[PDB]
């Protein structure tokens, strides 16, 4: 029950920190999988649902493992084709492969499916899949918070404008973050309607019929820190904002 | 490369094959420590083009929901192969019902039943389909707790659902008709199937194809008439009063197998029947053991 969830202790002594790879290059590690995850799966033409189940599968193996040994361009591939299955989404192993070799080599040519690299490649991305079964100890049943937000924004009755920032927000904070290793999803889910109703000037206590555990002490801290990796991140913050 | 969470399978000493005969590769196995006994599954992968099996994903998926007396248990994965680890039950209703030697009486009749119309009402109400009903199937253990088992071809559901399922000899007239629309009455009605089973000790309608069932659904439960189950169109106590003679038992027996699906009892109703809640009421499982 807390074996998916770490203390931020536990995230600065990540098996990746072994090999010596910084905090911050850890960070950029994670978000750029996510990215890729992302691009991946909207070309494959999944939900983000399917997305989100990748991206915590990624972040969750990087728990045990090490970028330094295991790259995000390695296994992004591998969490989204299992993720894929896991949610009942399948995409062919060659499809995914294709899409993969594509977003990470625009301008390359796909190999001839008979050549012996190309079998390789296929072969390498079934032993990825196979080590992040084992390396999650099967538990691939992820509860994401958008079900939650959802929820909230009902629950405080949002305008349709107020209940899309909020998930965009929870979209974000798995990206950008790693709250998903930190907090539980209905905890993630009320930092990001917080957040959502601040930047909207909204206001609504609420949070205590979400989650018994949530202080709007812990809200405030956590929504800092959200907003500033979006302040920190190109036309991500223009999505959302009020131009009118 | 390292692995906290998924232990190597050679933690347990393999016992016996028991069995290929049971839809694959199943074997009775022995902690190496403790003794505790359980069974292996393995995941079979020949012409398995897409890695990991999708199909052990959903099982495994599934296993990993139920938690419940009467659901088989799941205890972790292994690896080496990958092998499912299940807590080890030593029989199972058809072995029972095969076996001269084994005597149910009524009342343990009624306990077999109330356990396995319990799982299933539990399964359901997780949004989770069996669709495997069959004697073989359902475990019991040492101790006379009864498992449902083989979750294989189980799936979740809340509807275009696949029409390739459960064994011929169990499957539904919803089924056989080509419905793709069906839920949880079709568990219920392979419940009626065992139900039977438990007195004719043999599977009361065996056909060879699709249609052959459908000719013998028939012969039992009437036929199938827009009257009798309603927009169908896009003798039940007689043949068993030999049997079963008891009448509480015959009633439930033909409301699980009722041709209207929608019409069919379902798990919490058929709990509820006076079957289990007249005398000789429901008793444990020893003697039968
Ligand atoms: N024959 C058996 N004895 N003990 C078992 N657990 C057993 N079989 N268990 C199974 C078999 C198949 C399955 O999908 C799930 C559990």
Redesign the pocket.
């Given at each position: 029950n807390k074996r998916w969830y770490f203390t931020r202790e536990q995230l600065e002594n990540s098996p990746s920190r072994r090999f010596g790879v910084d905090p911050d290059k850890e960070l950029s590690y994670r978000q750029q999988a996510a990215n890729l995850l992302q691009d991946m799966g909207q070309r494959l033409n999944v939900s983000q649902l399917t997305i989100n189940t990748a991206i915590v599968y990624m972040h969750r193996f990087y728990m045990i493992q090490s970028f330094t040994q295991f790259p995000g361009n390695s296994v992004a591939p591998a969490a989204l084709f299992l993720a894929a299955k896991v949610e009942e989404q399948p995409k062919k192993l060659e499809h995914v492969i294709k899409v993969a070799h594509t977003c990470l080599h625009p301008q390359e040519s796909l190999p001839d499916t008979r050549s012996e690299a190309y079998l390789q490649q296929v072969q390498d991305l079934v032993i990825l899949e196979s080590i992040i079964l084992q390396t999650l100890g099967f538990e691939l049943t992820i509860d994401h918070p958008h079900t939650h937000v959802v929820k909230c924004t009902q629950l405080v009755r949002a305008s349709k404008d107020l209940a899309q920032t909020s998930y965009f927000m929870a979209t974000n904070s798995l990206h950008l973050t790693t709250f998903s290793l930190q907090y539980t999803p209905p905890v993630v889910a009320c930092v990001c309607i917080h957040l959502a109703c601040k930047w909207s000037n909204w206001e609504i206590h609420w949070w205590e019929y979400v989650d018994a555990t949530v202080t709007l002490e812990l809200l405030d801290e956590l929504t800092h820190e959200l907003l500033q990796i979006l302040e920190k991140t190109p036309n991500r913050l223009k999505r959302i904002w009020n131009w009118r | 490369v390292e692995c906290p969470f998924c232990d190597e399978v050679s933690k347990y000493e393999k016992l016996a094959k028991?069995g290929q005969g049971?839809?694959?590769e199943?074997f009775?196995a022995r902690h190496r420590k403790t003794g505790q006994k359980?069974?292996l599954?393995k995941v079979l992968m020949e012409n398995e083009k897409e890695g990991f099996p999708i199909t052990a994903l959903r099982?495994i998926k599934i296993?990993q929901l139920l938690k419940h007396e009467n659901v088989?248990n799941?205890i972790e994965i292994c690896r080496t192969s990958i092998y499912?680890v299940?807590?080890?039950?030593?029989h199972?209703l058809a072995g029972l019902l095969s076996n001269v030697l084994v005597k149910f009486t009524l009342s343990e009749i009624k306990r077999v039943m109330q356990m396995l119309l319990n799982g299933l009402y539990y399964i359901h109400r997780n949004k989770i389909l069996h669709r495997d009903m069959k004697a073989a199937n359902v475990?019991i253990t040492r101790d006379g707790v009864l498992?449902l088992?083989?979750?294989?071809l189980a799936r979740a559901f809340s509807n275009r659902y696949t029409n390739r399922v459960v064994t011929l000899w169990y499957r539904p007239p919803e089924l056989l008709l080509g419905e793709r629309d069906y839920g949880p009455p079709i568990d219920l009605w392979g419940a009626g199937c065992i139900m039977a089973e438990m007195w004719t000790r043999s599977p009361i309608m065996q056909g060879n194809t699709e249609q052959h069932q459908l000719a013998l659904i028939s012969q039992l439960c009437g036929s199938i008439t827009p009257e009798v189950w309603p927009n169908v169109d896009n003798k039940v106590k007689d043949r068993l009063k030999a049997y079963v003679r008891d009448p509480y038992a015959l009633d439930l027996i033909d409301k699980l197998l009722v041709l209207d699906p929608a019409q069919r009892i379902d798990s919490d109703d058929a709990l509820n029947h006076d079957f289990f809640w007249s005398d000789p009421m429901p008793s444990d499982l020893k003697g039968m053991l």
């Open positions: - | 028991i049971t839809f694959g199943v009775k359980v069974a599954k099982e296993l088989v799941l499912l299940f807590d080890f039950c030593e199972d475990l498992k088992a083989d979750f294989g």
